[PDB]
Design a binder for these strands. Structure first.
Ligand SMILES: Nc1ncnc2c1ncn2[C@@H]1O[C@H](CSCC[C@H](N)C(=O)O)[C@@H](O)[C@H]1O
Length: 553
DNA sequence: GCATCGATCG
DNA sequence: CGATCGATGC
């Protein structure tokens, strides 16, 4: 179900992190600080951020006027109690919806942790309302609308320090957020906390410190701070252990490895390079990494998007009904005809180059076909057993409103793709993965929703698919990915999405090095008698890829 | 049509 | 620890 905390985003910020954010805000503030400074928290909740910033300000002998807004009355009451029990008298709380979906004069400082509510929980209607009101595109999240609103409620030269999900840094839905941030603020600092797990909830948070633009026109170079968990440590890399708690690591000004308790964290500090190009994800990398990235891009002949279609698997929107392995254990009246049961490949049966399989027994009840040259859903009158099987789940299948709004049948697979494209030789790879697992497939099976597949644009997969495979499975491409597309989940899992794989560079497919790579990949995928010679061939491929683009790192 | 996005989700 | 899977946007 969807808990009230899930729909309202009621997660409170830990004490030490709040203090760190408040201290950075008061360090970046360069505006008078002798009069009463107004501070705003548009989603104050418990009032933790206001308490932290007031503690720091009273440490600096700075008088604040704290203002909190929250549409829940229990949060208002507890925040009022906590603020009264402190030694502060000048505060004010407002029980209202901040997005306004009285009056308030503009503010000098904004410290905020807005709620992160995805588009599915908001519903399409409120999502389109928020998009129309705050000029947002794509799958809007609530914190983006909150950013727009709280920025509109801020003075010129005022400092914002706001912690949100980091996903706006790399997704295409965060394009609008990146555009807004770079349009309205002189970016002071962007801290990607990565997988440090400060909150009990599963989220990778990022903090944004900025100064709102004026009109006299200003300068400063935007810097970033990235910290991630490091599982694989290089032998020649030294680790620093001069810090006890993780909260002490957010005040380090030297990049490198730091050991805290049971974990080792890689910390990088550098500059944001040209954030005005908000189209592509904002690359947070050091100088050497960025120069290597730019050199690889300059020496590249093209990209995968120019050579091959990168499609997603089937999205049935009812996996428990359409994809099963126990088709023979069902009653004989409901066992569908084998004409409809097509073998499928999931993300679990995924190795590099090629998997041996076991028949998987995983088969999908494919509901579409090529009738009169077009893609049409099947007729259940021809398949009575499949009709009965689907009548068994009619309740769950007909509860999909988006299917009925499209004037489509209730028993259909939502995204069936083209039934004739499955027979083409293709590359397959899983989405969620710590390592690239791209492999070749000839037998003409269907691809699962947790996987993507690749088919050539020109009708000659004779060599291009093999070259793309040899490129994608290399450590070179892994470094390129970790530099360019920084979308990671917990435990080092990268996201191999279409918007990321389309930007994989490709060397000249008629180079001698490229042809040797193609031959080596053919040997790897065809013959399966190799064991640890696979590592030798892979290292040879690495050296050939290096010679294809440029030499080493 | 078809790829996204996840205060992930047990 | 580890790999979602179904509403959603365009
Ligand atoms: N539309 C809205 N307008 C105002 N407050 C809202 C809101 N939607 C959610 N909230 C409030 O936002 C809070 C998110 S929890 C954040 C608490 C606090 N900012 C902290 O970091 O400690 C909740 O208390 C919720 O009641």
């Amino acid at each position: 179900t969807v808990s009230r905390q899930k729909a309202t985003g009621a997660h409170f910020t830990p004490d030490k992190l709040a203090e760190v954010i408040a201290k950075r805000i008061l360090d970046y503030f360069k505006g008078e600080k002798n009069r009463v400074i107004r501070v705003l928290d548009p989603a104050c909740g418990d009032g933790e951020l206001l308490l932290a910033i007031n503690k720091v300000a009273q440490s600096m002998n700075i008088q604040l006027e704290l203002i909190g807004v929250d549409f829940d009355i229990d949060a208002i009451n507890i925040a009022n109690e906590r603020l009264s029990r402190s030694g502060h008298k000048n505060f004010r709380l407002i029980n209202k919806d901040f997005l306004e979906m009285e009056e308030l004069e503009p503010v000098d400082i904004i410290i905020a942790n807005p709620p992160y509510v995805r588009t599915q929980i908001l519903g399409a209607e409120k999502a389109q309302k928020l998009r129309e009101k705050f000029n947002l595109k794509g799958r809007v999240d609530l914190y983006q609308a909150f950013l727009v609103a709280m920025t509109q409620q801020l003075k010129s030269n005022g400092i914002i320090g706001v912690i949100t999900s980091n996903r706006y840094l790399t997704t295409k839905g965060g394009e609008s957020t990146r555009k807004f941030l770079v349009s309205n603020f002189n970016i002071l600092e962007i801290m990607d906390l990565g997988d440090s797990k400060f909150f009990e909830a599963a989220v990778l948070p990022a903090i944004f410190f900025g100064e709102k633009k004026n009109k006299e026109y200003q300068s400063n170079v935007p810097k970033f701070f990235k910290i991630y968990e490091q599982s694989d440590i290089e032998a020649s890399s030294s680790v620093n252990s001069e810090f006890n708690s993780l909260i002490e690591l957010l005040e380090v000004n030297k990049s490198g490895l730091y050991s805290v308790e049971d974990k080792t964290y890689s910390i990088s500090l550098g500059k944001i390079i040209s954030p005005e190009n908000y189209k592509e994800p904002w690359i947070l990398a050091t100088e050497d990494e960025y120069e290597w990235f730019m050199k690889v891009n300059q020496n590249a002949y093209g990209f995968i998007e120019d050579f091959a279609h990168v499609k997603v698997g089937i999205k049935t929107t009812a996996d428990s009904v359409f994809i099963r392995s126990d088709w023979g254990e069902l009653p004989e009246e409901q066992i569908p005809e084998d004409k409809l049961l097509r073998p499928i490949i999931s993300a679990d049966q995924a190795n590099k180059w090629s998997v041996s399989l076991v028949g998987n027994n995983k088969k999908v009840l494919y509901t579409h076909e090529i009738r009169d040259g077009q893609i049409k859903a099947i007729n259940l009158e021809e398949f009575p057993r499949a009709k009965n099987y689907l009548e068994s789940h009619k309740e769950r299948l007909a509860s999909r409103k988006y299917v009925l709004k499209a004037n489509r049948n209730w028993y259909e697979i939502w995204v069936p793709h083209d039934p004739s494209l499955w027979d083409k030789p293709k590359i397959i790879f899983p989405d969620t993965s710590p390592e690239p697992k791209f492999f070749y497939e000839d037998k003409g099976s269907v691809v699962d929703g947790n996987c993507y597949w690749i088919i050539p644009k020109k009708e000659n997969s004779n060599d291009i698919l093999f070259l793309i495979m040899g490129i994608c499975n290399s450590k070179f491409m892994s470094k390129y990915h970790d530099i360019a597309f920084q979308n990671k989940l917990y435990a080092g899992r990268r996201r191999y999405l279409t918007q990321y794989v389309n930007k994989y560079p490709i060397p000249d497919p008629e180079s001698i090095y490229s042809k040797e790579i193609i031959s080596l990949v053919r040997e790897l995928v065809n013959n399966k008698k190799e064991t640890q010679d696979i590592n030798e061939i892979e290292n040879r491929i690495e050296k050939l890829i290096l010679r294809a683009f440029d030499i080493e790192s």
